[PDB]
Design a protein around this nucleic acid. Structure first.
Ligand SMILES: [Cl-]
Ligand SMILES: [Cl-]
Ligand SMILES: [Mg+2]
Ligand SMILES: [Mg+2]
Ligand SMILES: [Mg+2]
Ligand SMILES: [Mg+2]
Ligand SMILES: [Mg+2]
Lengths: 107, 108
RNA sequence: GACACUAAGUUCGGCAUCAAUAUGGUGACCUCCCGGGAGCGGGGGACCACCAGGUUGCCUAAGGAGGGGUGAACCGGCCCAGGUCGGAAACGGAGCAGGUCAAAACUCCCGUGCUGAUCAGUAGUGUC
């Protein structure tokens, strides 16, 4: 029941039809499922990385380009896990904003 | 053939079953040849070509075509949901196979 | 009869052929939402290109919304085997090869404007 977050969703180098889900203004260079998980897990979000899954609209097969990330929004009872994270859009955006800060990118 | 069956047909079929053992034993010294576990390797190699075009297929030097214009390798890889290395691999075996065929005949 | 001039006939060549609009399409791209565990399902705006037949500018000597072709390894659009990806599945997606095309692009032939040359020597008029 967790939700799905594919890097294509947060890629500013992709068009709409190519899988982008957020405005280019907020999108990111080349987000990696890893980075996505690393910023989500570090906010109190329950999430696990599906390293080998591949996004259907992703012609490339390389690594930097594949993997999937799963985050728990609601809890079995119904309450959101983190009030500040209603929707999926909420997480996508939060991620798009925090990755360009990861030390590994400011390097 | 016409959705029917002539003696020449029966002949050609028996003939196909002939150039077997031979062609098969010609795969002898070629690292890239477990009967079922081979068929896949053979069906894969074929599907990859299911993505090449006539001009590429019918080329005296396919290896180069692809060598010189790498985009073709990428086009093929992606077009047959296989990896890029896979394609280059298929390309080298075809070379080895070519060179082999050279030392002997070709049609047989 | 012999010459001229206007109208004009034949043929092989040359040069050249707008603009701005509504309605409906196709495509591309962006931007907002709802639903959903994925592939997605659903709905609102914006921009650009092109097409179908339809106007008008007050537009040029002409400028028709004509008819083909090619479509490129990929790099236009469709349909997409296989394989690939998501899916337990049902299916769905990206998509090469292959096929295809009112609607990427590029090109011919039409027509239409001037225009050399050619051939005819008829139609009229005029001259000696
Ligand atoms: Cl969306
Ligand atoms: Cl690429
Ligand atoms: Mg005159
Ligand atoms: Mg073609
Ligand atoms: Mg093509
Ligand atoms: Mg299929
Ligand atoms: Mg599709």
């Amino acid at each position: 029941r967790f939700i799905c977050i594919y890097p294509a969703y947060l890629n500013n180098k992709k068009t709409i039809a190519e899988g982008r889900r957020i405005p280019i203004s907020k999108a990111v260079e080349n987000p990696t499922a890893t980075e996505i998980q690393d910023v989500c897990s570090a906010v109190g979000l329950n999430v696990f990385l599906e390293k080998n899954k591949m996004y259907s609209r992703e012609w490339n097969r390389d690594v930097q380009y594949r993997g999937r990330v799963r985050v728990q929004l609601k809890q079995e009872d119904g309450s959101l896990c983190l009030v500040q994270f209603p929707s999926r859009k909420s997480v996508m955006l939060y991620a798009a904003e925090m990755i360009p800060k990861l030390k590994t990118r400011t390097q | 053939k016409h959705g029917q069956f002539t003696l020449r047909d029966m002949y050609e079929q028996f003939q196909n079953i002939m150039k077997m053992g031979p062609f098969s034993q010609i795969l002898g010294m070629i690292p890239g040849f477990n009967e079922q576990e081979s068929m896949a390797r053979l069906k894969k190699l074929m599907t990859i070509m299911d993505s090449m075009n006539d001009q590429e297929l019918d080329s005296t030097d396919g290896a180069k075509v692809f060598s010189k214009q790498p985009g073709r390798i990428q086009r093929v890889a992606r077009g047959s949901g296989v990896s890029t290395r896979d394609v280059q691999e298929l390309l080298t075996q075809y070379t080895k196979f070519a060179q082999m065929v050279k030392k002997m005949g070709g049609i047989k």
